[PDB]
Amino acid sequence: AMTTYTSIANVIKERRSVRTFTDKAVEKDLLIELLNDATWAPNHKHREPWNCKLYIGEGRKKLVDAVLNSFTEEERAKRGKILSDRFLSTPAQIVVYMNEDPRQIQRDEDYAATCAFMQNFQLLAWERGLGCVWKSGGLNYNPLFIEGIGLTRGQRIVGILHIGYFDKAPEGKARTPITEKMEIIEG
Amino acid sequence: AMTTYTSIANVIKERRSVRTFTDKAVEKDLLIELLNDATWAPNHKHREPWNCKLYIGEGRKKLVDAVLNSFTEEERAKRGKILSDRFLSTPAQIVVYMNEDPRQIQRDEDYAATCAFMQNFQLLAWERGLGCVWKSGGLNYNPLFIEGIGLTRGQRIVGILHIGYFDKAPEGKARTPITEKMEIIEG
Ligand SMILES: Cc1cc2nc3c(=O)[nH]c(=O)nc-3n(C[C@H](O)[C@H](O)[C@H](O)COP(=O)(O)O)c2cc1C
Numbered sequence: 619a620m621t622t623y624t625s626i627a628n629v630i631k632e633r634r635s636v637r638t639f640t641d642k643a644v645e646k647d648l649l650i651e652l653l654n655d656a657t658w659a660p661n662h663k664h665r666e667p668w669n670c671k672l673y674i675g676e677g678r679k680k681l682v683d684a685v686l687n688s689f690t691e692e693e694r695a696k697r698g699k700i701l702s703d704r705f706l707s708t709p710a711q712i713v714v715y716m717n718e719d720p721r722q723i724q725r726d727e728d729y730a731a732t733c734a735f736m737q738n739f740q741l742l743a744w745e746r747g748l749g750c751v752w753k754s755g756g757l758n759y760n761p762l763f764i765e766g767i768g769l770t771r772g773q774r775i776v777g778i779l780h781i782g783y784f785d786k787a788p789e790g791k792a793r794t795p796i797t798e799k800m801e802i803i804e805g
Numbered sequence: 806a807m808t809t810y811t812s813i814a815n816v817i818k819e820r821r822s823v824r825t826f827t828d829k830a831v832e833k834d835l836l837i838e839l840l841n842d843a844t845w846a847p848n849h850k851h852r853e854p855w856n857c858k859l860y861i862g863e864g865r866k867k868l869v870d871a872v873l874n875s876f877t878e879e880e881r882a883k884r885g886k887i888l889s890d891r892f893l894s895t896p897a898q899i900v901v902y903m904n905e906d907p908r909q910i911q912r913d914e915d916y917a918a919t920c921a922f923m924q925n926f927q928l929l930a931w932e933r934g935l936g937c938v939w940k941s942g943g944l945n946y947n948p949l950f951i952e953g954i955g956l957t958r959g960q961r962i963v964g965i966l967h968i969g970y971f972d973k974a975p976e977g978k979a980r981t982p983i984t985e986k987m988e989i990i991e992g
């Protein structure tokens with residue numbers, strides 16, 4: 619019996635966005651376990667701004683219905699079936715949202731915290747062999763989709779995480795050395 | 806140098822925001838190494854929107870000066886000394902910033918990537934026994950501060966990381982079960 623002492627550096631660097639999943643079953647209790655660990659994200663004044671909708675199994679069709687009903691007839695003709703088939707061969711979706719504070723600093727802080735929570739989650743999931751992609755784009759800003767999944771105005775969708783077990787890790791893309799993006803002032 | 810954690814979950818759960826630092830010196834090369842690990846955050850379209858200014862040693866006085874110059878003479882006289890003493894007993898500050906895309910979607914994605922980069926750095930640093938706090942608030946939105954550090958309009962400061970070795974930190978605050986802020990759509 620050997621316990622492993624993996625540097626979190628390894629997880630951070632090995633994590634990949636995964637967009638295609640095996641038909642292996644993702645346990646709900648595992649996702650809840652991971653999300654609970656993710657809640658240890660920094661968050662100003664302990665506002666804990668993050669909230670979630672988890673769509674799994676038959677429920678995923680409800681999300682799909684909200685997605686499709688939000689498209690113009692042209693988008694829908696283009697991506698409807700494609701996207702429906704994709705969502706339905708993805709074990710879980712997690713819509714991550716927050717109440718939008720009318721004030722810049724508090725909203726930015728909340729959004730920062732909500733992104734830290736999602737990144738935590740992605741790291742936590744990678745560790746157990748779960749892949750995921752953090753989705754954005756115009757769908758998340760579409761008032762038709764937002765009402766369609768039961769959110770009110772002034773609730774912001776930070777991301778939709780698509781999650782499941784996967785066959786092969788996608789390849790990485792080399793990062794720019796931080797020294798090209800930084801000034802050092804030892805002046 | 807390496808790690809005694811048996812899970813990344815533990816690093817995530819045990820990380821604390823640290824505000825007071827010991828006088829132990831912090832390696833500039835170490836901070837750069839950690840920053841380079843942090844760049845493995847998700848970032849839509851491989852935009853890598855993060856940029857940094859690292860203030861270390863005598864360089865910190867430049868930062869302190871920018872801060873004090875953004876204050877009224879009243880603030881300066883009252884706070885100025887206690888502020889300098891604190892910054893100058895903080896081994897390092899990193900101002901993390903981005904260029905603002907005129908478009909909401911790309912901008913928010915870039916902000917979220919940058920927040921994910923910063924949370925990565927916090928966890929990477931905790932691993933090495935380095936504490937920090939992500940400072941936000943009005944200083945970062947003050948046009949006199951922003952100019953003072955050499956930033957232009959449309960360059961958003963996402964946080965200032967204050968970083969050092971430490972021997973005390975705030976007690977961890979109990980998190981709200983995620984079950985209290987989620988809905989499961991099972992059918
Ligand atoms: C973007 C954002 C802004 C923050 N701003 C500040 C701040 O301005 N001043 C401060 O002392 N801490 C700041 N922190 C607060 C701590 O990160 C937060 O209180 C933390 O969650 C406290 O519990 P912790 O020890 O688990 O991190 C900020 C965190 C986030 C993510």
Ligand SMILES: Cc1cc2nc3c(=O)[nH]c(=O)nc-3n(C[C@H](O)[C@H](O)[C@H](O)COP(=O)(O)O)c2cc1C
Nearest residue numbers: 634635752753754755847848849850851914917918
């Ligand atoms: C806020 C944010 C939004 C993203 N949105 C999408 C998305 O809309 N669709 C997608 O395929 N990937 C999305 N990603 C992933 C990126 O497209 C990008 O390829 C990836 O993060 C870089 O590769 P990696 O995550 O495997 O390291 C997003 C990442 C971030 C941080």
